[PDB]
Design an enzyme around this catalytic site. Structure first.
Site, short mmCIF file in Angstrom:
data_model
loop_
_atom_site.label_atom_id
_atom_site.label_comp_id
_atom_site.label_asym_id
_atom_site.label_seq_id
_atom_site.Cartn_x
_atom_site.Cartn_y
_atom_site.Cartn_z
N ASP A 166 19.78 63.95 -4.27
CA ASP A 166 20.33 63.65 -2.99
C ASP A 166 20.03 62.23 -2.55
O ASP A 166 19.16 61.99 -1.68
CB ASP A 166 19.93 64.65 -1.98
CG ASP A 166 20.79 64.68 -0.73
OD1 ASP A 166 21.81 63.97 -0.74
OD2 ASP A 166 20.48 65.46 0.24
N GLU A 185 20.74 47.48 23.42
CA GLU A 185 19.50 46.78 23.38
C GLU A 185 19.66 45.30 23.08
O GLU A 185 18.73 44.49 23.33
CB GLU A 185 18.49 47.41 22.35
CG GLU A 185 17.89 48.77 22.66
CD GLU A 185 18.86 49.95 22.45
OE1 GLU A 185 19.01 50.44 21.31
OE2 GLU A 185 19.72 50.38 23.25
N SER A 214 19.04 63.41 7.87
CA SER A 214 19.29 63.14 6.46
C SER A 214 19.59 61.76 6.16
O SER A 214 20.27 61.04 6.89
CB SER A 214 20.40 64.01 5.91
OG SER A 214 20.13 65.34 5.98
N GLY A 215 19.05 61.27 5.06
CA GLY A 215 19.24 59.95 4.62
C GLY A 215 18.27 58.92 5.10
O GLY A 215 18.11 57.82 4.55
N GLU A 236 22.66 53.24 24.51
CA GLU A 236 22.52 51.98 25.29
C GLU A 236 22.56 50.75 24.47
O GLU A 236 22.39 50.82 23.22
CB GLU A 236 21.17 51.95 26.05
CG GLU A 236 21.04 53.25 26.74
CD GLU A 236 20.20 53.36 27.85
OE1 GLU A 236 19.02 52.94 27.74
OE2 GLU A 236 20.87 53.89 28.83
N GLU A 245 21.03 45.30 18.06
CA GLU A 245 21.81 46.06 17.10
C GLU A 245 22.70 45.12 16.25
O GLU A 245 23.22 44.09 16.72
CB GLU A 245 22.68 47.11 17.79
CG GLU A 245 22.04 48.14 18.67
CD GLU A 245 21.90 47.72 20.14
OE1 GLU A 245 22.01 46.45 20.45
OE2 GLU A 245 21.71 48.63 20.96
N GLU A 261 18.74 49.51 15.81
CA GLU A 261 19.05 50.46 16.78
C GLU A 261 17.80 51.16 17.28
O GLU A 261 16.81 51.31 16.59
CB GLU A 261 20.03 51.44 16.17
CG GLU A 261 20.55 52.59 16.96
CD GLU A 261 21.40 52.04 18.16
OE1 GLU A 261 20.78 51.47 19.08
OE2 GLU A 261 22.68 52.12 18.09
N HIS A 314 24.45 63.68 0.32
CA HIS A 314 25.14 64.71 1.01
C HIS A 314 25.76 64.19 2.35
O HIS A 314 26.59 64.88 2.94
CB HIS A 314 24.32 66.00 1.25
CG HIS A 314 23.39 66.00 2.42
ND1 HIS A 314 22.02 65.74 2.31
CD2 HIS A 314 23.60 66.25 3.72
CE1 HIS A 314 21.46 65.84 3.52
NE2 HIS A 314 22.41 66.06 4.40
CA CA Z 1 21.31 50.89 21.26
#
Ligand code: CA
Lengths: 235, 62
Positions: free
Chosen positions: A89, A62, A185-186, A60, A65, A55, A41
């Protein structure tokens, strides 16, 4: 996540965030260096999605990422939003360039169908995401997590006018106050087994968030593991 | 002797499959290998799935 806590850096190194027309709109989980599992979805063939692994705090930097583009979206072949928005789903995202795995970017383990279900039946999992921290409220800046107990199917059916299918499960608290929410979600529902985390669910849907007598509803991953393994195989 | 996948997962940390004569064979998910004791699972790659590798060490004071 409503009523959760801030994660520590590296606590959920399989967790990713999806950015698109709206930032941080959905979560996901790392299956391997090239593949993310998320909710159908959340996605759809051809709308611009980027994935960020490693993340923690979405405003911000870090310097852990990893940002990747999605080259292919594979909603489960049984998913059909015109018939039911949340049945089956589940979807897969193929990254254009691989992630580089490290302590902040690590896949979630996925067992076979039987063991996935065995793990789910332990009855306690962790959900995580950058979704709303109240129903219709503000979203999280720092990744939130929550341990949720499995809810008996009959209890879950009695709680709602909606249909809970066999490829769904219910988790949360009868008294309300703690739940996954819009924007989560997910993301993953995971079960820790002797120190190793396994994917047992996908965050999917619910009626409001964190209300008394209502539960979070999750995609039952055990139903989809063969498909995940087949689509995501690298070797 | 008495070991079986039907009871305590054959003592396997992860996965169990029954072998001949009421022995089991333990096994592990991708990125792990069976430990010396033929029961437990240990990493076989640097960043195996499902492992938190950053210390969570924290504390609450007053
Ligand atoms: Ca970040």
């Amino acid at each position: 996540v409503v009523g959760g806590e801030d994660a520590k850096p590296g606590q959920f190194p399989w967790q990713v965030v999806l950015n698109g027309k709206v930032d941080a709109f959905c979560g996901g989980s790392i299956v391997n260096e090239k593949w993310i599992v998320t909710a159908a979805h959340c996605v759809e063939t051809g709308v611009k999605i980027t994935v960020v692994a490693g993340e923690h705090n979405i405003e911000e930097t870090e310097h852990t990422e990893q940002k990747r583009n999605v080259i292919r979206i594979i909603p489960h072949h049984n998913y059909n939003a015109a018939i039911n928005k949340y049945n089956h789903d589940i979807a897969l995202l193929e990254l254009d360039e691989p992630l580089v795995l490290n302590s902040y970017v690590t896949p979630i383990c996925i067992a076979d169908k039987e063991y996935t279900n065995i793990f789910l039946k332990f009855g306690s999992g962790y959900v995580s995401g950058w979704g709303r921290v109240f129903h219709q409220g503000q979203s999280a800046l720092v990744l939130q997590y929550l341990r949720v107990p499995l809810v008996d199917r009959a209890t879950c059916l009695r709680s709602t006018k909606f249909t809970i299918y066999n490829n769904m499960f219910c988790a949360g608290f009868h008294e309300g106050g703690r739940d996954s929410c819009q924007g989560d979600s997910g993301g993953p529902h995971v079960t820790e087994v002797e120190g190793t985390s396994f994917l047992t669910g996908i965050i999917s849907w619910g009626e409001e968030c964190a209300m008394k007598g209502k539960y979070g509803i999750y995609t039952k991953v055990s139903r989809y593991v063969n498909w995940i393994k087949e689509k995501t195989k690298l070797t | 002797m008495d070991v079986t996948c039907n009871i305590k997962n054959g003592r396997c940390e992860q996965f169990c499959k029954n072998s001949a004569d009421n022995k089991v064979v333990c096994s592990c998910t991708e990125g792990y290998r069976l430990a010396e004791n033929q029961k437990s699972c240990e990493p076989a790659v640097p960043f195996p799935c499902g492992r938190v590798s950053v210390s969570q060490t924290s504390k609450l004071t007053r």
